């Protein structure tokens, strides 16, 4: 439980730096902009996760069905295995049945 | 391609005549349509045998 003896340099953060000032800027783009582009397109991320949501099982099964054949051998394997495990666990376990 | 014509299609530089079935496509659509969908008169006559048999 021995704890840090010397004060760290206080991290100074300008909340006024570019990215933070400009946060959430185009959020209303569809509405204010006579909808053409959806808020979705403001999402920069992993191919299969854009404008979508799900629990682990759905995520995984999705990554598979989308990028599956572009994955490395080993990751792929671990993915199929995680899938199986999850199948078994969500369907076949719980308190609530 | 079809969809792209629908969007703009003037500017899309899509060949218009291509938006209709080919001679093959045409004769096949023809073949199936006359196959599974009989004539109105012909359907009435299909019904007369039934109604009279049940009578």
């Amino acid at each position: 439980f021995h704890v840090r003896v010397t004060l760290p340099p206080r991290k100074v953060v300008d909340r006024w730096n570019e990215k933070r000032a400009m946060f959430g800027v185009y959020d209303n783009i569809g509405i204010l902009g006579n909808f053409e582009k959806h808020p979705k397109e403001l999402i920069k991320g992993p191919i299969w996760l854009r404008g979508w949501k799900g629990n682990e099982l759905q995520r995984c099964i999705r990554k598979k069905r989308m990028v599956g054949n572009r994955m490395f051998i080993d990751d792929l394997h671990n993915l199929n295995k995680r899938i199986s495990y999850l199948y078994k666990h969500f369907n076949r376990h719980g308190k609530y049945r | 391609a079809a969809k792209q014509f629908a969007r703009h299609g003037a500017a899309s530089g899509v060949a218009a005549g291509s938006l209709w079935p080919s001679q093959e496509q045409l004769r096949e659509l023809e073949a199936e349509e006359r196959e599974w969908y009989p004539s109105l008169a012909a359907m009435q006559e299909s019904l007369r045998v039934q109604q009279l048999a049940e009578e």
Binding site: - | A15, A16, G17, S18, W20, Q23
Partner: protein, 133 residues
Amino acid sequence: EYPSFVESVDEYHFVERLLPPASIPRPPKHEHYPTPSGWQPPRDPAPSLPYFVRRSRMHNIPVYRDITHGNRQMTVIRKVEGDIWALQKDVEDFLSPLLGKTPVTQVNEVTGTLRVKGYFDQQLKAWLLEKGF
């Protein structure tokens, strides 16, 4: 071998019909009120009661019925701009002869909404046609 086609613009006013409205028609002014389906417009002036009821985006009176747990019956008055407390006074005082006792009330001041135990939907509809909201 692409079949030949013909480009003419005069049949386009047929296609014009098929486009749906993205905004609701203001309802046709008639000679006779109420209408066959029972629709009454709000007045030319508005009353001086220190509260008001916006009609629905359908120009219907914003009184609805709602249940909870299948057995709890409720009636919701919506879109009310003014002192709702007054509206509460007047509503419960309208209903009290009907039930012999004041009906239970929940006022939501921030929501601009009123809530009342039981189904008064029909009678509140009328009573807001009275005051012409």
